[PDB]
Scaffold this motif. Structure first.
Motif, PDB file in Angstrom:
ATOM      1  N   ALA B  11     -14.302  -6.456  11.594  1.00 42.77           N
ATOM      2  CA  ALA B  11     -14.252  -5.069  12.043  1.00 42.77           C
ATOM      3  C   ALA B  11     -15.297  -4.278  11.269  1.00 42.77           C
ATOM      4  O   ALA B  11     -15.353  -4.365  10.039  1.00 42.77           O
ATOM      5  N   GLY B  12     -16.133  -3.533  11.982  1.00 44.23           N
ATOM      6  CA  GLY B  12     -17.244  -2.885  11.320  1.00 44.23           C
ATOM      7  C   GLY B  12     -18.219  -3.850  10.683  1.00 44.23           C
ATOM      8  O   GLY B  12     -18.982  -3.453   9.803  1.00 44.23           O
ATOM      9  N   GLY B  13     -18.198  -5.110  11.096  1.00 49.38           N
ATOM     10  CA  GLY B  13     -19.123  -6.093  10.576  1.00 49.38           C
ATOM     11  C   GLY B  13     -18.672  -6.785   9.321  1.00 49.38           C
ATOM     12  O   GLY B  13     -19.522  -7.323   8.592  1.00 49.38           O
ATOM     13  N   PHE B  14     -17.374  -6.805   9.018  1.00 49.85           N
ATOM     14  CA  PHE B  14     -16.893  -7.340   7.757  1.00 49.85           C
ATOM     15  C   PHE B  14     -16.010  -8.539   8.032  1.00 49.85           C
ATOM     16  O   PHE B  14     -15.233  -8.539   8.983  1.00 49.85           O
ATOM     17  N   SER B  15     -16.109  -9.551   7.173  1.00 52.23           N
ATOM     18  CA  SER B  15     -15.355 -10.782   7.341  1.00 52.23           C
ATOM     19  C   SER B  15     -13.905 -10.592   6.904  1.00 52.23           C
ATOM     20  O   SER B  15     -13.541  -9.621   6.219  1.00 52.23           O
ATOM     21  N   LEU B  18     -13.729 -10.378   3.282  1.00 49.35           N
ATOM     22  CA  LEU B  18     -14.302  -9.108   2.845  1.00 49.35           C
ATOM     23  C   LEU B  18     -13.303  -7.961   2.995  1.00 49.35           C
ATOM     24  O   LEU B  18     -13.244  -7.073   2.139  1.00 49.35           O
TER      25      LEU B  18
END
Lengths: 50, 49
Positions: B11-15, B18
């Motif tokens: 979500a929002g580019g996060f693993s 993360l």
């Protein structure tokens, strides 16, 4: 053959522009470019044997 | 912002890891602020008495 060349250039380049617009929209959607780069690293990992 | 995920992967580019590390970071932040605040309170004039 020339007819096919001129038609192919336009069809192919239109497909490319669709692809690039979708990529940049994907980056802005997920967040940072680097985050999508991290998930790209994971997917490339699953694509190899790693 | 909303995510509606029970276990969010990206979500929002996060693993997924993360996100967990970000939550852990927020917990540590809040606990640090509370701790410093209570230190300043223990050094405050109102706690001398």
């Amino acid at each position: 053959w020339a007819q096919g060349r001129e038609h192919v250039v336009g069809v192919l380049q239109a497909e490319l522009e669709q692809c690039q617009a979708a990529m940049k929209a994907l980056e802005n959607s997920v967040g940072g470019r680097k985050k999508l780069k991290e998930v790209m690293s994971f997917v490339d990992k699953a694509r190899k044997g790693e | 912002i909303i995510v509606e995920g029970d276990h969010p992967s990206g979500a929002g580019g996060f693993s997924a890891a993360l996100l967990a590390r970000g939550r852990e970071a927020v917990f540590l932040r809040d606990r640090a602020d509370i701790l410093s605040l209570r230190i300043q309170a223990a050094k405050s004039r109102q706690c001398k008495t």
